[PDB]
Structure formats: C-alpha cells, structure tokens
Paper text:
In both ligand-occupied mutant structures, the extracellular part of the α3-α4 pair has detached from the rest of the protein, thereby unleashing its tight interactions with α5 and α6. In case of α4, this leads to the straightening of the bent conformation adopted in WTCa by 16° in F518HCaND and 26° in F518HCa. The concomitant conformational change of α3 from WTCa to F518HCaND can be approximated by comparable rearrangements.
[name], a member of the conserved TMEM16 family, plays a central role in the initiation of blood coagulation and the fusion of trophoblasts. The protein mediates passive ion and lipid transport in response to an increase in intracellular [name]+. The protein is inactive under resting conditions and becomes activated in response to an increase of the intracellular [name]+ concentration. Fungal TMEM16 structures have defined the general architecture of the family, where subunits, consisting of an N-terminal cytoplasmic domain followed by a membrane-inserted part composed of ten transmembrane helices (α1-10), assemble as homodimers.
Residue numbers in the entry:
A (entry chain B), B (entry chain A): 43 to 81, 89 to 119, 121 to 149, 202 to 220, 233 to 414, 446 to 484, 507 to 638, 645 to 788, ...
The structure:
C-alpha cells in the first residue's frame, strides 16, 4: 500500500531477440510496462509510479525492469505467478477444460484484470508511456525459440498474407490468439461473406436476365431510336445554365437503365428482403453455435431527466445540422466540379471532407458523453456505439437519400418552377434519371471507396510504424513498443465500417443488383486486410470475451426494417417501373390508348408531358424552340386544368402507393413467417447444450 | 409396488359438516377421490384401483376411504405426511420463507404432482369418477371449525360478493388460495380494467367532442335537410327486391355517423395505438413485479416434417372453410330475418350457432392435435391455444371483417353490376353505410352479448348445480362433489373471452370510441362474476404456477400490430372521413369546386355519381324514375369514359393509400420509440432484485 521498494531484479539484457521470458527464462511475460523518468512534475510522477509498482509487487505480481538499448526509456516485465493465476481463475469464472496450462491470451487478460483492480489512468495522464502484452514472434519469421509456438507466423502465413486469400479462415486460431471479440468479428465477417456470395449469384442471375432482354425492352429501344426518342425535345434541367436537350443521351442512359430497371430487379428486391431475413436468422443460429463452442457466456431525479432531454435535443440539433451540411456540401461540390471522370474526383473530395468531419464527429461524440458518462463500460460503450453509428448513418446515407427521395421529387412544371428563395430553382435529377444517378453513386461508393479504404487501411498504420522507426538487435518488448497501439474502440471502427457496408447493400438493393457482388469482393479483400494490419502493424490488445457483436445486432435489425421500407420507396418513387407497368396495363388500351392488346410501344411519347412557351421567360433565350416535354404527368397546355395533375398522374401515384402497401405488407408477413419458422437456436446446438 | 393392502383406517363419519381433517382430526385433507365399485371389467377395475391405492400408501401418502351418506359412492381422503411434504419441497423448487407450515394450496399442488407421477388417466378411463381438493368452508357461511381460517368465506365476503364491486382485489389472497395461474389471470384483469379506465375517460372525451359538434358537421345536416339530402334519389340496393329510396333514412343514420365519424375518432385511434403500447409495456413491468412478489420463477425426420406440413395445410383448409361458412351463415341469416329488434334476434341466433360450431371447433382442434401430440403440456397447450384462438378469431372477427373490408367494396355500377354467378348481385352495404353497420354490430356485441354472456356465466353453472343436486347433513367431500368441475382448459376460456374483447376494443376502435368504456363496465362486472362462479359454483382446481399469461402475450402483440393496420384500413376504406377530407381540401376549390375557401358544404351532391337508366333493366319496373345516384366515383353517363373511374376516384383512392402509409409509419415509429424509451422492468423492481 506504500512505495516500500522498487521492482526486483532490475537487470538489462537485449541479446535474445525473440524471448518472451525473463532473464532466467523460467517465467514468461504476460505484460510489459513502459515509463521514462530520468528527465516538480518529475518527482511527483516518480513517487506515484513507485507507489503503483509497489502495489503491483505486493498484490503478488513480479515486476522485472530493463532500459531500452536504443537509454531513457525503461521497460518493466510483468508476469503472474502460478498462485496468482490459480486464485484469479477461481475468482474470475473461467471455463477451463478439466479431464503452460493457460494460453498467453487468457493470462494477459487475467493480468490486465489485476491491473484494472489495482492502470489506464496512469497511461492517460502521461504517467506510463505504454503497457501491453507481447506477440509470439515477428509476423514474417518463425520464432528463434523452438519451444514457443510461432502462431503469429502461422496466422500471417495461412490467414493474413494475401496469398492465402481463398483459404478458409482458421477461426479457432484467431480467437485463441487474439480473443473472443476479434474471433467473433472475423466469424461474423466470414458468414457475411458467404451470405453475400449467395445474394451475389442471385443478383448476377437477375443482372443476366435483364441483359438478355436488353434487346427487347421496348421503351429503351424507343429512347435509343432516333425516330421516337430523338424527336422528343426536353426542357432545360436548370435555370439559364442548361440548354434544350433531346432524348438521345438517354439512349445510352436507358440501355443501362433497362439493364438495371426491369422485373429482374424487383424479383431481386423481394428475394433480398427474404435474404436479409435468412441472413439475420442463420447468423443468430451461428452465433448460438459459436457461443457454445467458445463458451462466450461468462459473468463477473427530475434534474437528471431534464439534462437527458436537453442533451438528446442538442444531439438531434447537431445531427440535423450535419444533415444540412452534407446535403449542401454535395450539391456545391457537384456545382464546383461542373465547371464520369469528374464523379470520381468529386467522390474522393467528398471522401476527404467526410473523413475530416468524421474525425470531428468522433470528437463531438466523445464530448457529448464527457459530461454524462456513467463510466460503466458496457452502457457507455453501447451509447457511444449508437451515437457514432447515428452520425455515420447520417453522413453516408444522407448523401444517397437526397438523391433517392428528395432530389427532383419536389419541383414543379417548367412554367413557374419551385423557386426555393432568393437563390432558387432547386436542382432536378440528371437526364438519365434519379435511379441511374443513385446507381452510379452506389457503384462509386462500393468499388472506388472500398478499394481506396483498403489501401488506406494497409498503408496508414504501416506508414506510421515506418516513420516512427525512422526517427541493432532489439528485444520483444522494444519491438512491440514500436507498434501502433490499437486505441480505445478500435474494433468498433471495423464493425462500423462493415455495418455501413451492410446498410449500403440492403437499403438501396433495388437500384442495382450487383451490390451483393461488389460487397462480396470487398469482404474477401477485407478479411485479409483486417487480419494483416492486426497481425503485423497494430500492437497486441488484451483479450476479452463477447457473446455477440453487441449493439450492432439491433442496429442491423433496424437497418433491415428500414431496408424493407426503403426498397419499397425506391421501386415506387425513384424507379420508373410502376409508371411503365401502369401504361402497359391500363393506358395502352382502347379507353385511354389505341393498342388492342397490352403492350409497351408508344410509351415514352405518351408518358411525357408537353409544355409550350406560355410561361423573365429564360427558356426563349436558350433556343428558337416552342414546346418542350418534361418528366411529369401534368395536363397538356391548353387543357382546362393545364399543368395540374391529370387522371394519369393520380392513377400512377395510386399505383405507387398501392405497390408500397402491398410490397411492405407481403414482405413483412414473409419475414415474420421466416423468423417464426426458423428456431433462433439450432437443433444440434440444443442437443449439445443438453450434454 | 404391489397391491399388498388397501387404504388404512376405512371408517365412516359424516357428523362434522365442515371438517377438513380425517376422522382423527390430526391431519387435513389434501385430495379426495371418487369411485364406485360394488356395481369382467369390475374385477379388473377393482384390481387396478387397489394397486393404485397400494402404490399411494407405499409412496408415503395416507389414504382414508368413506362412502357417501346419501351408499355406492366411496370417497377417499388423501393426506401427505410431514416427511413427504418436506422431501418434495426439497425436490420441487419451492421458495419457502425462512426468517401447517405449507398453505393448503401448495400442499394440494404437491399431492397432485405425486398423483400424476405415480391420476388423470384413471379419471379418463372411468376408474375414478372425480378427483379434487376441498374448500375450507361454504362461501356464504363461516367455517364450523374455529381454528381453520375461513378464507373462502373472506374471499366471498370481500372479493366475490357483488356488493364489494368497488373494493380492491385482494390479489395476494386469491393467489394464495386458488393458485398463481388464477391469481395472475385476475391481476391481468385488474390491470386491464385500470388501463381501460384511462382509455375510457379519453374515449368519452373524444365522444363528447364529437357530440358537441354534432350541430356543426355540415354533411350530416345536408343529408338530413330535405332540400339537399332529400332530393337525392338513390338506386335500389339489391336486384328486384328493393325499391328506389331517397336519402332521408340517412338523416338519422348520418346524425349517428357524425357522432361516430369525426376527427375525435381519429385522434382517439392514434391515442389507442399509444395506449396499447403503454398497456403492453406496463403490463410487462407489472408482470416482472408480480414475478418478484409472488416468486413465480420456478423450474421442475423427413416424414415427420411432411406430416407437419400436411397438418398445417389441413388446418388452413379448415380455417378457410369456416370463414366461408361464417360469411354464408351471417348473410343467409340476414336474408331470413329480412322476411333494430331484428338485429338482436339475428344476433342471438348467430350466438347460438356460434356456440354450437364452437363446441364443434374445440372437437376438431383437439382432433387435429391428437395424432401429432407431443404430450408435453407446454408446447401442446400453446399449439391448442393458438389454433383455437385462430378459429375464434375467424368466427368473431370475420363477421365484422366482411362488413368492413369486403361488403360493398367489390361491386359495380348499377348498369351491369358485379354479377358473381347464377345467383348474383353481390350485396352492397346498408343505406346508412358500412361504418354505421359495423358500429351497430360492435355495439350489439359489446352491450348485448356481454350482458348475456355474464348472465349465462352466472346461471348455467348454477342451474347445472341445481339440477345435479335435484337428483341431510353433508360433509365437505359430498358438498364439493355436487359442484361443476372446471374441465380442461377452463381458464383458457376466460382468457379467450377477454382476448376477444381486447381484439374488439383495439382492432375496431376507429368505428366507435365507446368500446373502451363498454369494456370497462364489462370488466368491472367480469371480475366479480369470475370470482363468484369460481368460488361458489365451480369445484376447486389444483393450484399451479405461471410467470405470465402465456401465448396470450404474443397473441396480444399480434393483435396490436394487426390493430394498427386494421384501424388504418377502417379510417381509409370503411370510414368516409378521407373522402370528406379530400373534398374539403382539394375539391371545394376553384379548379374543381366553386367555393372560395375550403369548406364541406355541397359534399353529398358532389360525391355521388349519377346514373340514368341506360343499362332486363329491373329499374324501370320499380318506379317511373329515370336517374338514380349511387355511392361510387364513376363518370356520369354520357361521358367519353362513362361509368369508368374519373379523376376524383383516383385522387380519393390515392389519398386513402397515402393516409394508410403515413398513419402506419407514424404509429409504428411512435410504438417503437415508446417501447424503446420504457424499460421492460421497473426501477424499483430492479432495486428489490438487487437485494
Ligand atoms: Ca476496408
Ligand atoms: Ca476493416
Ligand atoms: Ca426465430
Ligand atoms: Ca363475461
Ligand atoms: Ca369471464
Ligand atoms: Ca422496453
């Protein structure tokens, strides 16, 4: 309880490079302590460190210290004797198998439990420079010690090196080396990859179905036809900045659309609702099986309500402010890049700004909790998880929800457009369409940002380690000291990235079916990059235990429900499928159309709405034209209700709302049945539980 | 393990009238068995019963048998000695309080558990006529024995007597006397009554709001006025059976409608969604509180899959057939009663037919499970509960779903109506409207059928007991013998009645807001009737333990979700609120209407569709009239798309679908937020859990 004496056996030896034991070699190293003290704060830190070391020795730990060969830094070796291990294995409910004994992971967990009971406070307040366990050896080389297993080398060879990309994950080795959280993260990632392979082959089937009929989609042929889709002259998209345009750029746009907008995409969206349900249910079953195999189950006012309400209101205000900022920044970045290839540059500029404001968002997300922190790890972690996920959701998915549900959805007919305010003429979608723009944005996100994110993940920790080493034989503790410490909530970031990808896959799956395939390739690379940067660059973290992914499971459930709603809204409002269907059924018939049987020909001409120049009148300056046609269902000019919504408009909007209702109800019913018909715990797992 | 000897101490004594003990008086009676044997089957029954009694004696029980004073019926008293009770309280996980000992309820439960382990099989195969515990004393009189508590007398005086209808439920006494199942049923009933009081005062406020504005609803005044609602001549409701009618019966019909069809009803529907959410959440908290207080927490292939699928298919087929039978019988009973008071007679005829087919439905619901019975009580009971509830749901709620969502919804214009087949002209709703018919049906159900059900519950057990006694001092066993035995799933029927009432309250709350009040009165009477018939009429049941209401909780969750959907559909399709709203907002304006500002005057004339006689033509025979109007939004005759749906129809249907979408999404979001914001277990309950 007092700084009676210092760390015993203060001896220096760095000759053995890959020795995890002490100088005698009898006992291994379950933790390492780092401090620099030789150069009024200095004496206070010295006294407090001496007190802490004395407490550690008195509790039963053995501390042996050495100084860095490359001086002023002193490394202290921490080991738990046999008695300490036995007594804290009796205290901490550890599921030992009863028919050296403990793998180094659980030993380091025990010693960190001891440090917490008597550790992060010293490190945070500059007292201790670092404190960590040790790796077995260098990732690329076998350990010099024959006795010590070089399982880090094995994990680098068969699991982390890109050359073994196609091999199955040794999901038992990574959990026995790193811990249950890392192991369950990688198991969840692998299962997610398998389900993505299933959804990806189904989506490729749908894509090929839409590609084989690409030569028969009548509307796309008419758009490409110069005799039908060339005669149609459209109205300018913006004010005084766009000219009158025909419908022949929409030739290529609509070929790609007919590929990406057909019955195959709707079939795939229904299948994807089913597939999300199956993914969630079978992950519940796999999670139960992993819980059994790994034994993850272990155990160890008015003013306050007013403050909670005020903080929630402040968080909501901040979220709304960031929503507006993201929408404005993407609109103004598009405007900047106006004066394709430009999309990629705009995408990377938005990515850099998003990462800057993401760092800002992390800072504000810890600040908001700073004055309301219960300091209990589980609830604080879950609250921070929810808040950070809300922020990331806001950013990433607002950039896409603006295109899907807000862009072009609230404008008017060319005569008297919807003028917002002093700066007005709110942008409408591209000539290709809102759906094609959303598809291109999702493709850019998936492909380009997955590639660049994996490259950054590979390089940034490696770059930091390289620059740290830039500024001869070194022991294990010194080598581990020159490694990036994976800070607080590091695995949280990996889970967050994968949940963002899952939201991208499921929420907007009705736009392009290749999202599961693009996520499949990304995940196949992601397993290896996350394994490699954890194995080689980042310093080894103390193992712990987790029985599930955490708040990410409720987050995924909410994303699934929101995905049903969002896919219904995408097929109804963003997509053009329902107007085509309504024409083919109830407007190519004698009461409205002229065709005898239900067909699709003469659809583009009949859908578009005329607008003659009877309206400043900025349109006459653009050209000598007199009538332009726009993507709306108003009455023709000269009608008694001209520019007002006509019978066709309300028919189509009723069909859209009816489709939303029918699809949502049927999909929710099927999801309810599948979740009901699937036992969340497998029969084999029940049988082995009975034993 | 052999029939070595009979029941010891075979003596006859009936002098003591309310003696719960044996002849000696040292030991109380924990069970009574009924058998008659003095008159090949006889000797086998004698041998089997003697073996059963010998086994009971060997296991530790003491059995004394006496014959009835009024012969051939012999009653056997069953007592558990101190050693057996102690050893089985050690066996069965009983939470005895440590700072005669056991209350007779748990003693009876233990003895019944012993009988089951070594009782129902004998009763089923005529071996034992009946097997029951005994009550302490007569309900209306004190116990003759001074020492014995007269807690049945106390329950009658304070809780079962209708004179104490305003008292609090002695919810601890009823669970300590009857058991945890009955106790939790009555606790749920009391909490349901409290929440019904809340919903009832709110609904009375909404009804008052609709009743005060009864003189300001313009459309009802127009209907009543002979100048507007009298000149409108409507088409005959049926073919060759109904005449041309004006719109003046709809005067009174619309007065009542404007009372029951107003924004107050919509506000109350939203509030009822919130109230169902709060009811479920606070019942979860109350159930946790009762689990803590009462300590209810206790513990003690291809061919098969094909058979399960076949059984599910058979169940679905039977359900559909019963749906058809119920709709056909109600339609044909209405037809019979055609050739008000007639509704009441039709209601009671339907009630009699419903009870007959309910007996048949219980028979078929046990038959379907007989050949697939796992024989484990929990799963088989849950399956039977779900199937029987599905059947009762189909009956009760299909009689109303036909009126709401199908009657008059799929018909045609009077010229060439929807002719189904050889017998055709599908019936349209009454001149008052589908909503008024639904509200009248619900009022009949609630008021008349609740009063009649309570009267039947009071009389039928009492009448059966009277006729049984029809065919001088009688001891306890003989007194209990002449009582109606609450058979299998007896408590299930009470729960089913209350859940049917809950479904009527929640699913159709958008029709009339007095449903919560009518449920409140019914439940205040129901607590007393269920207490009285259980205490005085029905024979005592063996106590059991249950920590929740059972499958009724998932059933109520499903009913809540379906009630959100059903109230949305009722307000949209069955109710006329949305057409009125659409007229007032977007059809009393210059583009369509003539009025300057938004108003509701001239709504009835503008909504109805004209139809001149240009069609057999049964309409000319009925009268000399030439044009009639009908409740549809077709084009006027002579239009280029005459009798086809017009702009008004599609605008109205789009608004109906949009309201369904918006209301469902908002209500589900609010329910999600409230269930999230409310912890399922109370804070005080958590604090006492910590102790
Ligand atoms: Ca990545
Ligand atoms: Ca990653
Ligand atoms: Ca399930
Ligand atoms: Ca009743
Ligand atoms: Ca009852
Ligand atoms: Ca809750």
């Amino acid at each position: 309880n007092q700084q009676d004496f210092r760390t015993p056996e203060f001896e220096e030896f760095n000759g053995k490079p890959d020795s995890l034991f002490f100088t005698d070699g009898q006992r291994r190293i379950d933790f390492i302590l780092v401090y620099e003290d030789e150069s009024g704060t200095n004496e206070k830190q010295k006294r407090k460190r001496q007190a802490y070391e004395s407490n550690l020795i008195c509790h039963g730990l053995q501390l042996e210290a050495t100084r860095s060969v490359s001086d002023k830094l002193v490394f202290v070796k921490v080991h738990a004797p046999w008695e300490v291990l036995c007594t804290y294995a009796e205290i901490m409910h550890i599921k030992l198998p009863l028919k050296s004994f403990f793998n180094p992971a659980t030993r380091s967990r025990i010693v960190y439990f001891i440090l917490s009971r008597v550790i992060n406070r010293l490190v945070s307040s500059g007292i201790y420079k670092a404190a960590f366990p040790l790796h077995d050896c260098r990732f690329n080389y076998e350990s010099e010690d024959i006795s010590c297993p070089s399982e880090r080398y094995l994990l680098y060879r068969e699991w982390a090196h890109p050359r073994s990309i196609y091999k199955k994950q040794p999901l038992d080795l990574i959990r026995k080396y790193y811990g249950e959280k890392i192991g369950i993260y990688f198991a969840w990632l692998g299962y997610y990859t398998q389900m993505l392979l299933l959804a990806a082959v189904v989506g490729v089937a749908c894509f090929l179905y839409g590609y084989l009929d690409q030569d028969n989609c009548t509307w796309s042929k008419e758009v490409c036809d110069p005799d039908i889709g060339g005669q149609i002259l459209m109205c300018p998209q913006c004010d005084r900045l766009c000219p009158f345009w025909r419908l022949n750029i929409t030739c290529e746009s609509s070929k790609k659309l007919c590929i990406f907008d057909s019955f195959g995409t709707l079939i795939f969206a229904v299948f994807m609702g089913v597939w999300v349900t199956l993914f969630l249910e079978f992950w519940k079953r796999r999670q139960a099986e992993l819980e059994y195999e790994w034994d993850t189950v272990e155990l160890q006012t008015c003013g306050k309500c007013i403050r909670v309400t005020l903080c929630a209101s402040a968080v909501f205000f901040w979220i709304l402010l960031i929503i507006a900022s993201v929408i404005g920044i993407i609109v103004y970045r598009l405007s900047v890049f106006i004066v394709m290839a430009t999309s990629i540059t705009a995408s990377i500029i938005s990515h850099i700004i998003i990462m800057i404001l993401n760092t800002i968002y992390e800072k504000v997300a810890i600040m908001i909790t700073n004055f309301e922190l219960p300091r209990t790890q589980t609830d604080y972690e879950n609250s921070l998880t929810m808040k950070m996920f809300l922020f990331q959701f806001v950013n990433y998915y607002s950039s896409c929800f603006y295109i899907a549900f807000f862009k072009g959805k609230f404008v008017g007919y060319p005569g008297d457009p919807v003028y917002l305010l002093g700066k007005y003429r709110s942008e409408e979608c591209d000539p290709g369409g809102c759906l094609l723009e959303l598809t291109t944005q999702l493709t850019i996100i998936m492909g380009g940002k997955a590639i660049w994110n994996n490259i950054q993940e590979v390089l940034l920790p490696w770059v930091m380690n390289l620059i740290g080493r830039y500024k001869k034989i070194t022991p294990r503790w010194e080598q581990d000291y020159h490694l990036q410490p994976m800070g607080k909530l590091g695995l949280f970031y990996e889970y967050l990235e994968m949940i963002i990808q899952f939201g991208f896959v499921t929420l907007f799956v009705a736009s392009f079916p290749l999202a599961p395939l693009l996520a499949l390739v990304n995940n196949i690379l992601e397993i290896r990059v996350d394994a490699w940067k954890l194995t080689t660059q980042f310093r080894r973290m103390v193992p712990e235990k987790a029985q599930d992914i955490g708040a990410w499971q409720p987050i995924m459930q909410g994303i699934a429900i929101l995905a049903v709603v969002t896919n219904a809204m995408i097929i109804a409002f963003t997509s053009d499928m329902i107007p085509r269907l309504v024409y083919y059924w109830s407007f190519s018939i004698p009461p409205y159309g002229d065709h005898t049987y239900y067909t699709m020909d003469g659809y583009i001409n009949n859908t578009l709405s005329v607008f003659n120049i009877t309206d400043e009148n900025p349109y006459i300056g653009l050209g000598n034209y007199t009538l332009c046609r726009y993507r709306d269902f108003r009455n023709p000019p000269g009608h008694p209700q001209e520019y007002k919504h006509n019978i066709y408009y309300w028919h189509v909007i009723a069909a859209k709302l009816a489709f939303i209702i029918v699809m949502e109800h049927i999909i929710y019913s099927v999801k309810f049945f599948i979740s009901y018909a699937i036992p969340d715990v497998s029969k084999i797992t029940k049988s082995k539980i009975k034993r």
